Amino acid sequence: ETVENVSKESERIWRLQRARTILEFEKMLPEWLRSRFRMGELCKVADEDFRLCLRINEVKWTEWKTHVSFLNEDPGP
Amino acid sequence: DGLTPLQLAAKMGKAEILKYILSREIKEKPLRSLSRKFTDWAYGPVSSSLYDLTNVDTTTDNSVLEIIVYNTNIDNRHEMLTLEPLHTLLHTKWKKFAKYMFFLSFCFYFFYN
Amino acid sequence: QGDITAVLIAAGADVNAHAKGVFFNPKYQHEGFYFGETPLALAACTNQPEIVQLLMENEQTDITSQDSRGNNILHALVTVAEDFKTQNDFVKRMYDMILLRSGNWELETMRNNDGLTPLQLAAKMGKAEILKYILSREIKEKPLRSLSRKFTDWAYGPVSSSLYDLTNVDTTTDNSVLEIIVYNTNIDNRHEMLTLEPLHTLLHTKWKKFAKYMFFLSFCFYFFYNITLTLVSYYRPREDEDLPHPLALTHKMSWLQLLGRMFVLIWATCISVKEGIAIFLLRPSDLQSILSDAWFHFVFFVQAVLVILSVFLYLFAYKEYLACLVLAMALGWANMLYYTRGFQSMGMYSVMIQKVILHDVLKFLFVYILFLLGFGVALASLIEKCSKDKKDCSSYGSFSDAVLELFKLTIGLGDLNIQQNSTYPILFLFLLITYVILTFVLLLNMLIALMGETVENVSKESERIWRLQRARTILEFEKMLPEWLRSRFRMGELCKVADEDFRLCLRINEVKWTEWKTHVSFLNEDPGP
Amino acid sequence: TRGFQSMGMYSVMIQKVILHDVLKFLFVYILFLLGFGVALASLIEKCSKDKKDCSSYGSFSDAVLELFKLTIGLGDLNIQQNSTYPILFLFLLITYVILTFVLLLNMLIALMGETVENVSKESERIWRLQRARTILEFEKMLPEWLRSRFRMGELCKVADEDFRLCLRINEVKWTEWKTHVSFLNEDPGP
Ligand SMILES: NCCOB(c1ccccc1)c1ccccc1
Ligand SMILES: NCCOB(c1ccccc1)c1ccccc1
Ligand SMILES: NCCOB(c1ccccc1)c1ccccc1
Ligand SMILES: NCCOB(c1ccccc1)c1ccccc1
């Protein structure tokens, strides 16, 4: 299974052995100026405007549905 | 042990239940406050998804990535980091932050040798 | 909402609207969804066949309408339709539906603000699956089979002859389909597009009638070219004339022993002018094709110029008279890898050379330098610091000689005489054995590094890169072919439906068996005298 | 080497590579040979050489052969004794061995591509045809007298003649039973 296992496991060991470095660098990063990611705090339902921290993605095609979700726009200025 | 069930699903490494907890989209309106995935907007086959991401990011004590990636016991850490709230968050820590420190800590320890 | 939509049209909504907002987005993947901004295309883009069935029955609907980008509706379906197979694939089903609902041929002749027909836009965007429809498009009707691109010559049981309308397809107009498929670099699946029947047999016929014989001709010229540089410089028949000059044209030379020296000077200048024009053309291709193709334009040009600069160096007589010649001769034999295209497995081996040298040698070399320089410092204790027993009497370079005598082992050109020390040769060789075993494991993993779907991917992608890197040569040869006497392919101009006898240029095929049907197509015969 | 089931199946793989794919590799291996050989033959007869033009002959040819002996591994150091260009000699000649390793490493991958199936199985099926042609050739070699051999007993078919036709007996097997109405209902007989 070098067609699969010796190649793929050596890839997945590597991604874990790089993702451990990245969280190690945040311990190395000083607490001041983590002015970074963790996107804008939009509403959830409730009365507070900023409810929670967020993360934005870009999902895609077929299996449409007539959506009833949220602010019906494009993301805004 | 002091663990939330999201953290307990990560420490025990149960991947499939953790694909639900980090997504959890709820298409209702008495109780869509319990949902972890939201929507920014939807316009045909292009749509923007929003993740509630409270204990997920490395900003509190013993976060989810803190207890997935530093964990050694479980087998399928790679099957868990493929998931969308963990993945693009790891990519964004990579691109904005960790790529440039790694090349910086390269050129120091390479000029060292 | 289909029910609410018909109310709004009955209430008088503008069906020919245009939404010119910032959702066009060159940064496409976020906030985008370009759909050509008309209400007709939006139902056409988002799998709404009944609303398209509703909107195109409205007589006020401008189906021929354009966009801010100049796009009509068939441009809009092209710019959306993904190269995913059968996503209950609606766009090809609905591209089919719009032309058959309405329209003359005067809808795919419409160009955008780039000047592209929707066949060309499907090729430039590289949407393969919609382009398998446009180039086939057989229509088994008789109000509107004039819109069809595939026809039939005749049908007789399970043997039947197919005819392709082939207007903008062939390289006979400006910016044709093969012009914009094969020279394209942006899209991924150029090989998935050239497998298609109007493009394939047309590329085969340009290969067999035309490009095979020029390629062997341009082989035997550029192969006799490199023999001549070998037989001029490094021949020396008997006792040469006191360090001569290779490309010199001295007073008495029989006309077999200097015409080859003219043969170099002509065919180097013939190449130097040729890709010198490719400086004026290939401005964005070289950086975008950062590893794939068009490097061989450069390596031909660098080889041709350094021959000529060696002649310019003779007129000034600097020190690098011989230096610029030999790198021009060494690239000249290395340039034969461009002529390793042509045999179906030969370039398929040559692409695997180009894959490993570009991608994965620098992978292995960076690790192999690393254990070299790692054990080399470990070895250079045992030079200049250790016993050495007789040494500091040979040449130079304490660290450098310790590296090289550890670096000659990978050749196998191994020296024992560098190792004569005092009681540390126990510790020398068991160090140096752990070099060879460690540089065996770097070698053994290097074979496994190419492994990983070698049963499929390393073989098949090296084949499909080769077919694209040969199909780019063939269209390059037609630019090389002069405009007079292209009396060639592009078969006879038979009728379509209309009153003109010669309607369009054609291409004949030989389709086959089961799933019969009682045919109503064309002239019911065999092809004719 | 026909005759053992895996022996010719190895021997056909010899006949496949020597006919098809050696001339593949040899045309590229001559190419980097003749490519670096001109690059090496600056460092013979044009460069330092420090003691040379006293040995045998052949300025370009000796520079080729001493670069051509490395593929054996029969490598000579004494051909390389020059002046300060042996820095540039060996790092040229290393880039010969690495380049003629990649030609060697891709040569293993050149036989790869469905070696799990096609290179093994086709070399088996070519062998079975190339052994079955021998066997019918031996019957042309066998003289016509005493072919008292196979072609089993001539049992009836339906008709009035007892010996109807020549035969061949097999031993077919299990499930999908049926209540048979075929022939002489026995075991084959004394
Ligand atoms: N587009 C993802 C880029 O980040 B991924 C990544 C790439 C290199 C090193 C570390 C992480 C990744 C993260 C989670 C799952 C899979 C891949
Ligand atoms: N305080 C220790 C810093 O060392 B660094 C380091 C730490 C662990 C492993 C390798 C290197 C470092 C990190 C980034 C850039 C430069 C150096
Ligand atoms: N019978 C096809 C021969 O031409 B094909 C071809 C063969 C060698 C080099 C270039 C092209 C071909 C053309 C299109 C798709 C696939 C193969
Ligand atoms: N005017 C330049 C002609 O060079 B030819 C050429 C052009 C590009 C790459 C290689 C060779 C050529 C073509 C066919 C036959 C012989 C030579």
Residue B37: DSSP 8-state: E
Q: Work out the number of other CB atoms within 10 angstroms of the CB of residue C321.
A: 14
Q: Which helix (H) or strand (E) holds B49?
A: strand B46-51
Q: Packing angle between helix C323-334 and helix D22-40, nearest 10 degrees?
A: 180
How far, in whole angstroms, is CA B108 from its chain's centroid?
30
Q: Which of D183, D178, D133 is nearest to D156 (CA)?
A: D183
State whether residue C337 sits within 8 Å of chain D by CB. Answer: yes
Return all residues near C351 (Cβ < 8 A) that are at least 6 apart. Answer: C462, C463, C465, C466, C469
Identity of the residue numbered D7? M
From the CA of C344, give the closest atom in ligand 3.
8
Asked if B54 contacts B6 with a C-beta cutoff of 8 angstroms, the reply is: no
Residue C342 labelled as part of a binding site: no
- The CB-side HSE value for C162 (13 A sphere, CA atoms) comes to 18
Asked if C180 contacts C173 with a C-beta cutoff of 8 angstroms, the reply is: no
| Alpha carbons C148 and C165: distance in angstroms, whole number | 8
Tracing tokens 């109807």 back to the chain, one arrives at D164
Q: Which of D145, D39, D163, D30 is nearest to D89 (CA)?
A: D39
| Alpha carbons C178 and C264: distance in angstroms, whole number | 34
B101 lines ligand 2 (CB under 6 A): yes
Return all residues near C376 (Cβ < 8 A) that are at least 6 apart. Answer: C399, C402, C403, C406, C407
State whether residue D41 sits within 8 Å of chain C by CB. Answer: yes
The two three-digit tokens of residue C478, written as one number: 């037609």
Q: Which helix (H) or strand (E) holds C135?
A: helix C128-136
State whether residue B50 sits within 8 Å of chain A by CB. Answer: yes
Tell me the Ramachandran region of residue C174: left when phi exceeds 0, alpha when psi lies from -120 to 50, beta otherwise: beta
Asked if C90 contacts C133 with a C-beta cutoff of 8 angstroms, the reply is: no
Give the gyration radius of chain B's Cα atoms: 17
Closest-CA distance, C51 to chain A, in angstroms, reads: 15
Tracing tokens 């660290």 back to the chain, one arrives at C399
Contact flag B44-C30 (C-beta cutoff 8 Å)? no
| Alpha carbons C219 and A25: distance in angstroms, whole number | 56
Asked if C340 contacts C347 with a C-beta cutoff of 8 angstroms, the reply is: yes
- Number of residues that make up chain B: 113
| Alpha carbons C342 and C358: distance in angstroms, whole number | 22
* Beta partners for residue C163, in sequence order: C151, C508
Q: Give DSSP secondary structure letters for C150-171.
A: EEEEEEETTEEEEEE--TTTST
Q: How far apart are the first and last CA of chain B?
A: 44
Q: Give resolution, Å, one decimal.
A: 4.0
Give the gyration radius of chain C's Cα atoms: 33
Q: Work out the number of other CB atoms within 10 angstroms of the CB of residue C114.
A: 13
Helix (H, G, I), strand (E, B) or coil at A56: strand
Contact flag D38-C353 (C-beta cutoff 8 Å)? no
Contact flag A23-B69 (C-beta cutoff 8 Å)? yes
Q: Work out the number of other CB atoms within 10 angstroms of the CB of residue B20.
A: 11
Q: CA angle, corner D38, sides to D32 and D40, nearest 5?
A: 95
Contact flag B58-A23 (C-beta cutoff 8 Å)? yes
Q: Which of D102, D106, D85 is nearest to D39 (CA)?
A: D85
Q: Which of C227, C150, C174 is nearest to C509 (CA)?
A: C150
Tell me the Ramachandran region of residue C31: left when phi exceeds 0, alpha when psi lies from -120 to 50, beta otherwise: left
How far, in whole angstroms, is CA B94 from its chain's centroid?
13
Q: How far is the CA of C449 from the centre of ligand 1 (A)?
A: 21
Q: Packing angle between helix C295-314 and helix C259-281, nearest 10 degrees?
A: 130
Tracing tokens 């699903």 back to the chain, one arrives at B9
Q: Which residues of A touch B78 (CB under 8 A)?
A: 12-13, 15-16
* Beta partners for residue D152, in sequence order: D167
| Alpha carbons C473 and B92: distance in angstroms, whole number | 42
The values of phi and psi at residue C511, to 5°, are: -65, 170
Tracing tokens 């309308």 back to the chain, one arrives at C165
| Alpha carbons C95 and C53: distance in angstroms, whole number | 13
B/D Cβ contact: 3+ pairs below 8 Å: no
Q: Which of C512, C519, C525 is nearest to C138 (CA)?
A: C519
Tracing tokens 């026909």 back to the chain, one arrives at D2
CA dist B42 to A57, A70, B15, B72, C1, Å?
12, 8, 28, 40, 15
Return all residues near C164 (Cβ < 8 A) that are at least 6 apart. Answer: C135, C149, C150, C151, C197, C198, C506, C507, C509
Neighbours, chain C (3 or more CB pairs < 8 A)? A, B, D
Classify residue C518 as exposed, middle or buried by CB count within 10 Å of its CB (0-12, 13-18, 19+).
exposed
Q: CA angle, corner D97, sides to D95 and D99, nearest 5?
A: 65
Q: Work out the number of other CB atoms within 10 angstroms of the CB of residue C35.
A: 27
Asked if C182 contacts C468 with a C-beta cutoff of 8 angstroms, the reply is: yes
Q: Give DSSP secondary structure letters for C25-72.
A: -SSTTTT-----S-HHHHHHHTT-HHHHHHHTTSTT--TT---TT---
CA dist C382 to C205, C368, C371, C374, C436, Å?
67, 21, 17, 14, 17
Return all residues near D28 (Cβ < 8 A) that are at least 6 apart. Answer: C337, C340, C349, C350, C353, D103
Give the gyration radius of chain A's Cα atoms: 20
From the CA of B78, give the closest atom in ligand 1.
15
Identity of the residue numbered D139? E
Contact flag B98-A55 (C-beta cutoff 8 Å)? no
C/B Cβ contact: 3+ pairs below 8 Å: yes
Return all residues near C146 (Cβ < 8 A) that are at least 6 apart. Answer: C105, C496, C497, C498
Return all residues near B94 (Cβ < 8 A) that are at least 6 apart. Answer: A22
Q: Which helix (H) or strand (E) holds B46?
A: strand B46-51
Residues D108-145 as b or e (16 or more Cβ within 10 Å = b): ebbebbeeeeeeeeebeebbeeeeeeeeeeeeeeeeee
Asked if C505 contacts C166 with a C-beta cutoff of 8 angstroms, the reply is: yes
Q: Which residues of C touch A4 (CB under 8 A)?
A: 452
Asked if C2 contacts C50 with a C-beta cutoff of 8 angstroms, the reply is: yes
Give the gyration radius of chain D's Cα atoms: 32
B111 lines ligand 2 (CB under 6 A): no
| Alpha carbons D171 and D185: distance in angstroms, whole number | 15
The pairs formed by D184-187 with CB atoms below 8 angstroms and a separation of 24 or more are: none
Q: Whose CA is nearest to atom 4 of ligand 1?
A: B91
- The CB-side HSE value for B112 (13 A sphere, CA atoms) comes to 7
| Alpha carbons C297 and A35: distance in angstroms, whole number | 48
Q: Which of C119, C287, C288 is nearest to C187 (CA)?
A: C288
The two three-digit tokens of residue D180, written as one number: 């048979």
Q: Which helix (H) or strand (E) holds B48?
A: strand B46-51
For C32, name the nearest residue in chain B, comparing CA atoms only: B46
Helix (H, G, I), strand (E, B) or coil at C342: coil
Q: Which of C151, B33, C383 is nearest to A43 (CA)?
A: B33
| Alpha carbons C462 and C347: distance in angstroms, whole number | 8
- Number of residues that make up chain D: 190
State whether residue C35 sits within 8 Å of chain B by CB. Answer: yes
| Alpha carbons A40 and A76: distance in angstroms, whole number | 12
Asked if D130 contacts D8 with a C-beta cutoff of 8 angstroms, the reply is: yes
The two three-digit tokens of residue C234, written as one number: 């490094």
H helix runs in C137-258, sequence order: 177-181, 191-194, 197-205, 212-233
Q: Give DSSP secondary structure letters for chain D.
A: --SSTTHHHHHHHHHHIIIIIHHHHHHHHHHHHHHHHHHHTTTTTTS--SS-S-S-S-HHHHHHHHHHSTTTT---STT---SSTHHHHHHHHHHHHHHHHHHHHHHHHHH-SSTTTHHHHHHHHHHHHHHHHHHHHHHHHS-SS---SSSB-----SSS-S----B-------SS------S--SS---
